[PDB]
Symmetry: C2
Subunit: 248 residues, 2 copies
């Protein structure tokens, strides 16, 4: 297989189940060399977040430069952005280096109205695939939570018009200019699922013909990771999936 | 195989070849769930270091607490410590949680005389295995660079007396209370070799009877990683080894 370098721009999880830790494990497990720009540090746990430590947007930019000025990046996954200046810094470097295959996860359960505003205007026109759930989609569109399937489909299409090449609305429906495509969990250890799925979609995209195929393989792989989550021995709270279920 | 959780306490490398990025990949490639406490951030490259961003020792401690208060750690690798307060914070948590199988790499090419002083007094008595090269060993002992084999053996033994359970002097000689044991590179892409070897020794220790056996398997694995370093496509400078040579 051809060599693919994948980059993750996100926050950290010391317990190793989410954040760039999860992104990097996923890249690794799916045959991609991993790079990582840290946007924020967090003392995180399997029992929750203890505290967040912010990083100067300027150093995030410096990190972005160290990577893009030296390593060819074939796919990129974006997680926690934290604030307006970070969003701007990321969007700016993405544009400058013509970064393709950008998968944007929607970590905003939080971001200021200013940060969100910047995200939709500066970042969205640069993402290949965005992966929000219902609450996040409404927030990105500043619209009411989708009540029915039609409203949900309308939001998916609205996000495309905003610049996204594709949208994966998590209930799952995949949106593309072409049309829509429709897509269980038996474990409580689901910590980092969101980070992992978006990382998987990023790592696998270059190995497929379309988003439909990569979305299909990504979900199959994730289900397998969740199906092995209980065999791990980490934490007293909600454990992480098992990224290396296929290896050990 | 029994589940083993490995922790790395070190700095970062956005280009993914060294730091916790390398430690985490190595843990993953060797069958261990990885955790990571970040001691310092650095805009690093395959062409060198662009800049260093320091983290408050208090947040390093907070990170240590998020991990030790929730995840059972079976092995630990220590890299960049940066300053006195970080060294102290790490030593203190190591002692409090009776952390075993501590592999201490010697990242000091730099540390203030105060930091080094704190390291030998507070940290050394807690490490299972230290892995310095000649220049680093002399610095830790505040002694002249070893001129001959005898002087080198003397330094190894001196470091044991200082509290280290074992010493791996990289020229390689392994030192233990029992005695000594003696242990090529055909690639230019050696970025992160030091981080990788110490991470490998940490991840493999629990799967072996003694340090001699784990040192033997760790080196075999590393040589294989270096022998595949050229098949990767990252950077314009000195590339990293291929941590996943055995998988893809």
């Amino acid at each position: 297989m051809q060599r693919i370098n994948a980059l993750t721009i996100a926050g950290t999880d010391p317990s190793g189940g989410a954040g760039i830790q999860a992104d990097l494990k996923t890249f690794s497990a799916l045959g991609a060399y991993g790079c990582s720009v840290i946007t924020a540090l967090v003392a995180e746990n399997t029992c929750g977040v203890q505290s967040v430590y912010r990083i100067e947007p300027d150093f995030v930019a410096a990190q972005l430069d160290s990577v893009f000025s030296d390593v060819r990046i074939d796919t990129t996954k974006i997680g926690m952005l934290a604030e307006t200046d970070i969003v701007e810094a990321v969007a700016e470097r993405l544009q400058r280096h013509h970064v393709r295959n950008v998968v944007l996860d929607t970590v905003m359960l939080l971001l200021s109205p200013s940060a969100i505003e910047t995200l939709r205007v500066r970042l969205l026109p640069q993402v290949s695939l965005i992966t929000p759930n219902l609450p996040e989609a409404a927030a990105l569109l500043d619209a009411p939570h989708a009540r029915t399937e039609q409203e949900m489909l309308a939001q998916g299409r609205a996000l495309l018009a905003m610049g996204c090449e594709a949208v994966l609305m998590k209930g799952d429906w995949l949106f593309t200019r072409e049309g829509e495509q429709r897509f269980r969990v038996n474990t409580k250890n689901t910590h980092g699922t969101g980070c992992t799925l978006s990382a998987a979609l990023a790592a696998l995209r270059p190995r497929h013909r379309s988003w439909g195929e990569t979305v299909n393989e990504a979900k199959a792989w994730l289900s397998a990771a969740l199906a092995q989550a209980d065999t791990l021995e980490v934490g007293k709270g909600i454990g992480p999936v098992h990224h290396f279920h296929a290896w050990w």
